[PDB]
């Protein structure tokens, strides 16, 4: 057991159980470290699931995910947990981690490969302050950032140096203009403490402090856990520095938003099935995977872009920026992979990865060719995405990975949220229609 | 003695004698540690009980409750005391701790069992700043908190970070949205420093900082002492951090209030009397306990819901029982062993006096067991404090059984709560201005 | 047609068709005066009533009065609500219910032209601020004459003369801050044919005043009560102040109540007048007994506001001398003006509804020969008693069961809304407990 070993080694005082709900937000609950024993892993911990959106259930801790916490003053051990319905003593039907595990099991069952490697790069925004409110009197989402392009006048305590990136021009300034070098270094430090393998970190296209920190790969469930850990680490590092981090797909206008580019690979018995004789070194399985993604792209948009903000931001190739899918340049056949570029950081990592894998497995099973390289594209609005998912849900249900009841409930939740957004007056409507 | 041993080992300089008044607020008196001896435990300490309503009185320390104080610069030893009438030398009639002790003695006398086990879960609120007033010029009330759902625009000395739980959406955000993790950890540390065994601590459903720190079970009087100690610990930890703890049942509108669920069990020679083969593995003793709680629930609201504010929260109002149907305010929590079999009543709120509320629940359960009251498989709790006091006055029969709750104490408590109720009720509400200013 | 005569005389340019919703707040819709023809009175004017909580506006020609606040010459006509489906009065119209009450009174033969005179008190506040959200529930009153402003700051100076708490019963205008304003309100009343009887400062500080006007039949008096509310509110607005008709807008001071003097006429002879106690006939005694019997049920109509039970004169018994009695017999020099004064009704009551309820209870007592218990202490209690004792209201078809159900639903929604909010005193006590 990794948990008890870590507890003994670091003499930790608290155990922070964690899990994930339907919306993708991680959830945490703390207990004393002295409560760990064989019973704690045999029966988990009872908790109330009514108050959580989309759902008396059990947090069964995952032994393999035990990891220390670098943000709590007392030594704390973080344990990600699965969710179990006490009636059946099995993984909860609507638990995203359970859905991801079922997707992995189905991938093994079909024989297309053993485990699928997922690596997503999400981008975030590091603002100083954010003041948003939308009530009857009106709406506002004002953003305060020292390095924002529009802040070229605002006097700042301690000085207003004139160095700051322009609009769409924050792509690799030297840290005189890139204000977030030390904060990105600290985020990478916290990521490495939590067991993540940081690959690279840099500024991104947008102004106001859009950054990216790409971390290593892993299997599906492990990578969803790593994505949640990355979100937690960057959020707390920004908070400790006196700043705020946003993973919204697009918190600005004009400037490119935040996207989660997901590299995808499949291994079968130790070898890569995405390498072979084909376009840019893609085997038949890789072509069928991309064809399945293309065929069910609108259906997949319900999970990869499950937010009204995703469509304020919204083919396979190797140079063509028009293509929503990229075949990245690699040096070895084992590293050959595809890349879906449309998914956003707001997506529920477990649900998104499971849905993408299901679509790709459907494409491989049906032997669907995506045509030649670089045109059907992603859906336009969240209502359109949910409608396509509702009437295009066959591959998720097939294989017993996504249950019909879960998808209906999740569609209801996202639909009510989209209705909430869609029926509120936009200040652009004031800008264009006031003097009518 | 335990107190003398602690004094000698920790070199304490002050002894802080604490007791509880009728309203449920702890009350303390400090003396030098050098003035402790055998005679101190034999005779107690004279003190004035005129300005509390429960004439000279005696503070007799309970040596078994001696504990240290981590909130003071000087080493202080806290001792919970019993109130003794000098004329009778017995326990005081209106002493809540004496009432809880009498409830334990009555439980032993009935032969139903011994060492009844109570575990409450009093949620609370953490506010950065609270301002209220009421006079002829008007009544004002406002609560300030950085993590408030309405504070999404407010300027802060440190910036307005956009992460804060929404309305009815504070149930287990991660720390970067859950603003109160370090303060909860500090409260848990203080609880461990007073001998309590914390089991879990987390945010709660409501915004503006509703938190819950569960603590392990104990006997009736011991758990009442632990509840008072937990309230003290959370209050002082928040005050050390520049914040405040609110324990009144409903300090907000439109968001979940603070409730104190009570898990009840009864032991008998080391065996659990609630474990059986009935519904959810409940023995018929447990079923009769449920029936007794149900029948006297309206009467129980007088003691377990003494606040006129508690009924702003009870708007868990079904007086039924089930392990699945969450409408009922009496739940049979899922357990992994019959040793931990228990019932749970969810209507009590943290504003209740621990001793009085626990004794009332125990006496209701005992009356149900003795009268073999079968609950069935619908009654509701009182809608206002006036109705609760009326029902308590009408149906105090079970409380007075065995001489646990005296009629004089019940009448004094009823009078005090009625004065508070008429004070609250006959004042103008700003919603009355919202509704009637233009009539 | 009185309206056409007034239009020709005053070159009226606008017509204000006014009615009253179930909540008693007067409602008005304006149309040009050139559209007033015989067809307008014959067929009324269509309006949409699906939005008002709880058809055709048929103007009451006899109640056409000039409006003294409009910058242009404007007439005001109080209108009945008529259902287009049946061309009859709307079942949920307070004016229609009051008219049915008078019809029933005339039908039963006890008497005709019940005389109602209400004395409502109001508050004049310089400023009032309030709000109630999850953040907090705030309420504050600003008044120069307020007893709590003895050390405050004002523009141009702070004169020290202002009435104390419960000490505002007729100071002189040095301390009576609202003599000119009261005379202006009286002038506005007199400019729409309201026979003002008396006007004075009342007990409470912060500007409580009473302007008692003459008597009239029940529907006419309800129209006059709405007229008085309109005029007083608009005069306070014109003077830069505000008027509150709430039963209890303060704490630690007196409230405001609509003391209703009631009597019954019969062919010009006062039926109440007699040789019994305080010179009250047996009919008057039966009236009082019926009011006492149904008092808790009556409180739903006479005290519909939750605020009313902050103001609550609770003992429901008659006395010409005792002050705790809530049904006093005011002294009168001549026997032809013998009347009984009920003090529990408050200014937040629908005048039509309250007067109809009081009259129906009194007539029920007359018919049942009841000969002689407090008022409800909460709005929920009052609504429960009203539901329990609705029989006398539905007697004669005056108060239909459907209307009482709708009124109960509306008032219950209001009471529940005000009953689940955290009073600031609840913080004052239970914050640290």
Curated annotation (Swiss-Prot), chain A:
Mg(2+) 1 binds at residues 121, 261, 339. Oligomer of 12 subunits arranged in the form of two hexameric ring. Its EC number is 6.3.1.2. ATP binds at residues 199, 263-265, 321, 326, 334. Its cofactor is Mg(2+). Belongs to the glutamine synthetase family. Catalyzes the ATP-dependent biosynthesis of glutamine from glutamate and ammonia. Residues 10-88 form the GS beta-grasp domain. L-glutamate binds at residues 256-257, 313, 321, 341. Mg(2+) 2 binds at residues 123, 204, 212. GO terms for molecular function: ATP binding; glutamine synthetase activity; metal ion binding. Residues 96-436 form the GS catalytic domain. This is Glutamine synthetase. It is found in: Cytoplasm. InterPro entries: Gln_synt_N, Gln_synt_N_sf, Gln_synth/guanido_kin_cat_dom, Gln_synth_cat_dom, Gln_synth_gly_rich_site, Gln_synth_I, Gln_synth_I_adenylation_site, Gln_synth_N_conserv_site. The keyword Phosphoprotein applies. Gene3D superfamilies: Glutamine synthetase, N-terminal domain, Glutamine synthetase/guanido kinase, catalytic domain. The activity of this enzyme could be controlled by adenylation under conditions of abundant glutamine. One of its GO terms (cellular component) is cytoplasm. Binds 2 Mg(2+) ions per subunit. It comes from Azotobacter vinelandii. Keywords: ATP-binding, Cytoplasm, Ligase, Magnesium, Metal-binding, Nitrogen fixation, Nucleotide-binding, Phosphoprotein. One of its GO terms (biological process) is nitrogen fixation.
């Amino acid at each position: 057991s990794k948990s008890l070993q870590l507890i003994k080694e670091h003499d930790v005082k608290w155990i922070d159980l964690r899990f994930t709900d339907t919306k993708g937000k991680q959830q945490h609950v703390t207990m004393p470290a002295r409560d760990v024993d064989d019973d704690f892993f045999e029966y988990g911990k009872m908790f109330d699931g009514s108050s959580i959106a989309g759902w008396d259930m059990i947090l069964m801790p995952d032994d393999s995910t035990a990891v220390l916490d670098p943000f709590t003053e007392e030594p704390t051990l973080i344990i990600v947990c699965d969710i179990i319905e006490p009636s059946t003593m099995q993984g909860y039907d609507r638990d995203p981690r359970a859905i991801a595990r079922r997707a992995e099991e189905y991938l093994k069952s079909t024989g297309i490969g053993d485990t699928a490697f997922f690596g997503p790069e999400p981008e975030f925004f590091i603002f100083d302050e954010v003041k948003y409110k939308s009530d009857i009197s009106g709406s506002m989402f004002k953003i305060f950032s020292e390095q924002a392009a529009w802040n070229t006048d605002a006097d700042f305590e301690g000085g207003n140096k004139g160095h700051r990136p322009g609009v769409k021009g924050g792509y690799f300034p030297v840290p005189p203009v890139d204000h977030d070098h030390e904060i990105r270094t600290a985020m990478c430090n916290a990521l490495e403490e939590m067991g993540l393998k940081v690959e690279v970190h840099h500024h991104e296209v947008a102004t106001a402090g859009q950054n990216e920190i790409g971390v290593s790969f892993n299997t599906l469930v492990a990578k969803a856990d790593e994505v949640q850990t990355l979100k937690y680490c960057v959020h707390n590092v920004a908070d400790a520095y006196g700043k705020t981090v946003t993973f919204m797909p697009k918190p600005l206008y004009g400037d490119n938003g935040s996207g989660m580019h997901v590299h995808m690979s499949i291994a079968k018995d130790g070898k890569n099935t995405f390498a072979g004789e084909g376009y840019a070194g893609l085997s038949d399985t890789a072509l069928y995977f991309i064809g399945g993604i293309i065929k069910h792209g609108k259906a997949l948009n319900g999970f990869t872009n499950p937010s009204t903000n995703s469509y304020k931001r919204l083919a396979y190739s190797a140079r063509n920026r028009s293509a929503s899918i990229r075949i990245p340049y690699v040096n070895s056949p084992k590293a050959r992979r595809i890349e879906a570029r449309f998914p956003d950081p707001s997506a529920n990592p477990y649900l998104a990865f499971a849905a993408l894998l299901m679509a790709g497995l459907d494409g491989i099973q049906n032997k669907i060719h995506p045509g030649d390289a670089a045109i059907p594209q992603v859906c336009g609005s969240l209502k359109e995405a949910l409608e396509e998912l509702d009437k295009g849900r066959a591959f998720l249900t097939k294989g017993g990975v996504f249950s019909d009841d879960f998808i209906d409930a999740y569609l209801e939740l996202k639909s009510e949220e989209e209705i909430k957004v869609r029926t509120f007056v936009h200040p652009l409507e004031y800008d264009l229609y006031y003097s009518v």
